[PDB]
Amino acid sequence: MREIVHIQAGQCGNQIGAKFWEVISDEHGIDPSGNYVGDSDLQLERISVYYNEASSHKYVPRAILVDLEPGTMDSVRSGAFGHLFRPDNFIFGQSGAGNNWAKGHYTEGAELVDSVLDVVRKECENCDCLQGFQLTHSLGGGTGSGMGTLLISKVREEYPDRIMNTFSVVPSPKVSDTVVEPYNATLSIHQLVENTDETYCIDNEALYDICFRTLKLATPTYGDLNHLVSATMSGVTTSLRFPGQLNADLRKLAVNMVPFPRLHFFMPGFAPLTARGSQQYRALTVPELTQQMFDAKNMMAACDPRHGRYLTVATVFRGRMSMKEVDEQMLAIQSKNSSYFVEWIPNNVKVAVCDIPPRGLKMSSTFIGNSTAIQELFKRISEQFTAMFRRKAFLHWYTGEGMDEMEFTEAESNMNDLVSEYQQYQD
């Protein structure tokens, strides 16, 4: 039972992670009090990886929540699992998360992260075995990225023989405002690349473009985003939570998935996307499910995979259907869409099936891809930063608290390097 320590920080990170944890607990059926009220014994067979044990035999999920605005538990209790997290490790800041990198990444907050690292180190050893670390946040500026990549650097320092993972969200100038973020993102990911190899780029722009246009919305609120993300990035780890064919561990997930030590930006999707409606819907069929699988609109990234090629694909079906027939349409897709995949990497279709269905849904399937497609999103975020770097806007605070211009230029150089790598490996 290789346990996982969950790291989590930031206003958006906590918002997404609360609903994610609620979804996973509900699917596993443990009561919001913290006791097993599930409906079978296939739940607690090895699930200690996410849920530890208390003295009174009640379970206890392990996940750290930190920030720099003092009120987090005041906002963490906004759902249904406030006291559920152990009530001694809600380390809180003092100021807030203005969109200022290095205001958490160099001087203040960095003072707090030493104690944070001490606490997480103390937290880790109690388990029987360690799997690694995985982190949920957004690349959003304002203590959201600083603390994130900072703690990434120190955890990678302390445990080189484990695996990182980021559930970060790329900001976008369609849903949001306070436009200094391109700096924050394109600078933090600049060392996220060297510091981590396991990433999911849930494009907020794509989430809006699919949630407001063709999902019957008028003003997408933050809970609206939280529904879709707490669906997809909660179903992404069912393979970890549930035994099955592709039980691959973090290290093994990587070795099956990441060819090169940098080209590791997975772009996920989820075929039965659903806005918040209590009624489930009419039923869907397996070929329809696996066809909405590659729905370009369905993609949680900013591209249509038809416009590019894949490298290493996974898939996790869920429900009760034809177990052994899924290979038929897997090979059908392979045969009719050879151009979509690449010849450099044969048999890039690792597939598996999980018996359990999700909450409020019978037939569904979480998806993971790895394609050249995210070159489009990176070109977007690179132009949406370079077209404004010429005016040197707002770099006063950054240049005052400990950055410099050469750092900005070298970050742009690194990201042009990544887009070049994607381009050439597409060529």
């Binding site: 100038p173 405002d177 436009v179 404004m388 005016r391 806007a393 707002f394």
Partner: protein, 436 residues
């Protein structure tokens, strides 16, 4: 708790300080005694107005601010005025020799021999307070005091307090009330030595205010009383955000962030719609949409410039009383319909809005007509180029004839230094020209 300190240098500065401070004391329900609004009456308040006034034992709400000039002409003239006991006696400094329109006089002759006392007093005042945020500067370009002493003082402040922001309320000078022809010289000599220390500056234009007091306020010979009262009203209409409640543009840092892209360029335009004159009873009525759409008109723009011919960079507003957001958004949408306004090609340029729950308070015995609606646009329009280039042109006309140079030279300036400053501000004009 938080707090802020407003400095007052120069005759014009201290006149506007008296007018503004009396208006502010009136507005909050405070009185020339400051008995009590509704609070603990000793170390009370707890609303935003405490950031200006602090209660003594009597709950007097003493305004922790000082007034400075180099001649006991005006300082005393108001020290025995209406607010004799409002401020602390022996907390208003009086110089001896007037700077006499000589920038070097305030920079290396007399202000340099007294600035230590001012520094001691302001540092003691800061020790008295606990929640200092920054500084509010009331000075003028033309005067020797309000330029040289201003620059040297703020240099000392930036040396010792290198973190807090600061806001400058200067007065752009006009020929029609000009009391010198060395006025562009002092203006350049001070402003060329501000950017390195200045954070944001609200400069007001004498000719603009004069045209406001006449063409709409029904005056023909406005004294310093009329112009000063009107500019005190507009300054209150600006700072009401800091005065009352959490809304758009609460903090000085928030001010500059919402306003200042690039540190060198921190001169934002300002407007305030109600300039309706006086006891003239009623020719029409008021409306939120009316005043909001008429705000864009060049009528009330604090400094004479042509905004419609220049690309914008941001837009903030503020409203007094009669709150309802819906018609405010409707008015924004109506004015949003891109008649000729433009914006920045690389960032969102929304019309940020923060409303306030109190109608404007008018002086009990003055010209302004009571109203209840208001707007206050702190537009960061690039079109202040025109005015700066006009002042620079008026400057370099008189440099081929080496006019008046010796007068500044005699106290420790340099002749070629003026050329360096002129090139600095030619480059600043180029910087405005860059945005296109």
């Amino acid at each position: 708790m938080r707090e802020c300190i407003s400095i007052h240098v120069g005759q014009a500065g201290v006149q506007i300080g008296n007018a503004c401070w009396e208006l502010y004391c009136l507005e909050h329900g405070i009185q020339p005694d400051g008995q009590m609004p509704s609070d603990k009456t000793i170390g009370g308040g707890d609303d935003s107005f405490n950031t200006f006034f602090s209660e003594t034992g009597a709950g007097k709400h003493v305004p922790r601010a000082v007034f400075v000039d180099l001649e006991p002409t005006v300082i005393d003239e108001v020290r025995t005025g209406t607010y004799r006991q409002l401020f602390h006696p022996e907390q208003l400094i009086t110089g001896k020799e007037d700077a006499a329109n000589n920038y070097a006089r305030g920079h290396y002759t007399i202000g340099k021999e007294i600035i230590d006392l001012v520094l001691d007093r302001i540092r003691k005042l800061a020790d008295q307070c606990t929640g200092l945020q920054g500084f509010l500067v009331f000075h003028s370009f033309g005067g020797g005091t309000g330029s040289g002493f201003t620059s040297l003082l703020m240099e000392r402040l930036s040396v010792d307090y290198g973190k807090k922001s600061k806001l400058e309320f200067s007065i752009y000078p006009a020929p029609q009330v000009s009391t010198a022809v060395v006025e562009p010289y002092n203006s350049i000599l001070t402003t060329h030595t501000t950017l390195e220390h200045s954070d944001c500056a609200f400069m007001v234009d004498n000719e603009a205010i004069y045209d406001i007091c006449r063409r709409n306020l029904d005056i023909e010979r406005p004294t310093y009383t009329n112009l000063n009262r009107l500019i005190s009203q507009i300054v209150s209409s600006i700072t009401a955000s800091l005065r009352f409640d959490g809304a758009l543009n609460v903090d000085l840092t928030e001010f500059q962030t919402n306003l200042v892209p690039y540190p060198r360029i921190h001169f934002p335009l300002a407007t305030y719609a109600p300039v309706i004159s006086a006891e003239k009873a009623y020719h029409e009525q008021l409306s939120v949409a009316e005043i909001t759409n008429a705000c864009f008109e060049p009528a009330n723009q604090m400094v004479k410039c042509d905004p419609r011919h220049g690309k914008y960079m941001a837009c903030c507003l503020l409203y007094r009383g009669d709150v309802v957001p819906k018609d405010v958004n409707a008015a924004i949408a109506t004015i949003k319909t891109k008649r000729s306004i433009q914006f920045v090609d690389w960032c969102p340029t929304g019309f940020k809005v923060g409303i306030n729950y109190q109608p404007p308070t008018v002086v009990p015995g003055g010209d302004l007509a009571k109203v209840q609606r208001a707007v206050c646009m702190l537009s960061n329009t690039t079109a202040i180029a025109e005015a700066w280039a006009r002042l620079d042109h008026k400057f370099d006309l008189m440099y081929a004839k080496r006019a008046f140079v010796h007068w500044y030279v005699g106290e420790g300036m340099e002749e070629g230094e003026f050329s360096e400053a002129r090139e600095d501000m030619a480059a600043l004009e180029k910087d405005y020209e860059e945005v296109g």
